[PDB]
Design a protein around this ligand. Sequence first.
Ligand SMILES: CCOc1ccc2cc(-c3nn(CC4CCNCC4)c4ncnc(N)c34)ccc2c1
Length: 457
Amino acid sequence: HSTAIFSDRYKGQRVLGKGSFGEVILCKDKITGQECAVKVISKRQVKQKTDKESLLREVQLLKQLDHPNIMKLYEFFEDKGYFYLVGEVYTGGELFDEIISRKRFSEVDAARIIRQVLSGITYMHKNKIVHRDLKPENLLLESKSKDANIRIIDFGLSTHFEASKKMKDKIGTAYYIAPEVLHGTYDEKCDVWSTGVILYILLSGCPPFNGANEYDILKKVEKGKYTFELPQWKKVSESAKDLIRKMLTYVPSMRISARDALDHEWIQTYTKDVPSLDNAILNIRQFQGTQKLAQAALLYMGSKLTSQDETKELTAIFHKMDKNGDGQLDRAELIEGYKELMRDASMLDASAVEHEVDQVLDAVDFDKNGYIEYSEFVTVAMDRKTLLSRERLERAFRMFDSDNSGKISSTELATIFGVSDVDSETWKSVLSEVDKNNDGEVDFDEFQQMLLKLCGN
Ligand SMILES: CCOc1ccc2cc(-c3nn(CC4CCNCC4)c4ncnc(N)c34)ccc2c1
């Protein structure tokens, strides 16, 4: 009897994106052609909280659960360096990204959204599974269809894996986390809190607990106080605010349960004219842009650091390989050395590496059947990734700059770097080095420059 190997069954199509605990890779069954979204959790980057026995049992259970608002899980694999969580793929993107793209959004729309969330949660709770880390990024739409269902992701991971302490992994988490979770004693009621935060945001476009940085947000959450004294709350029903109050009740025993929330007057009324919440849409669009850009900023810096690391490592690997030191390696050698390097969740296969080497070779017009200048290859393979990272950031800059002004203001930078948890006098210092004209604003290139300076370049 043999232990099942992931890559024997699945091939990687492409990267779907970055999630909690690992990279998510779109994959395809080598026989049946079934497409799946595979979260790949790196054992080196993420520590386990539970034992083997406890994990395997949870997986086994999760595979048998079924609910339209919960991500479907098909398979589980494990090897020396990784876990592989194989689930159903969803094509509709993040809930909030869909919402800002609309012209109209009412309490009716919000109620139908929250019912779906509460429904999925209620089910998982019945089965003694807690999310804990529930937020808008974990709410995916099933498809691109207007009336596509919401699929909750990452249920059950937090019980078994330790959360990353890295800011690039924590963006947005602080707004939604329940106070009891901070202090250590928590139960399924923490998920009702998070949903309550999400609802508050849906109807006002602002987080109830907010701050200049991660810790300030957490101070507010811990204190647990909030208000409906914003202007845009005047547009909202009393019942909506009543449910929010009940979900954002501090003491968890006093907090309304998920199942009881589904029976709340507000849910019952609005899910059976209602004005549009135009101000809420405005605020959510701004909120989302800011979050997405701070994320992009952190990923860019991370990619730059990774590249500096990998560039020198790859060169050192090939140098050792280049035994007579003439600078000439062949394709099979480049592959072996690239393999030794990756020893990219997307590259966890021999054929993946063969493919990627070939892509690099084709770009530089090097003949693949002869011998190659490895120094030249290295430059291209890394520049590709550097170029890719630059493009992702730019897109985020342009989206944030909704007025197409070409610029980001000093106030805006304060917000962005606050969310990125970059020290104030630190970024200001780097801004001072770049903005020698006292314009109090930066263009894309200047902004990029700052980020390079904030990662030791
Ligand atoms: C017991 C849990 O086992 C599993 C197994 C697979 C999982 C797959 C996904 C997943 N991630 N992404 C990438 C999106 C990029 C844009 N930002 C939002 C996410 C996805 N995109 C589409 N569909 C997906 N299913 C995912 C998330 C959690 C999973 C958990």
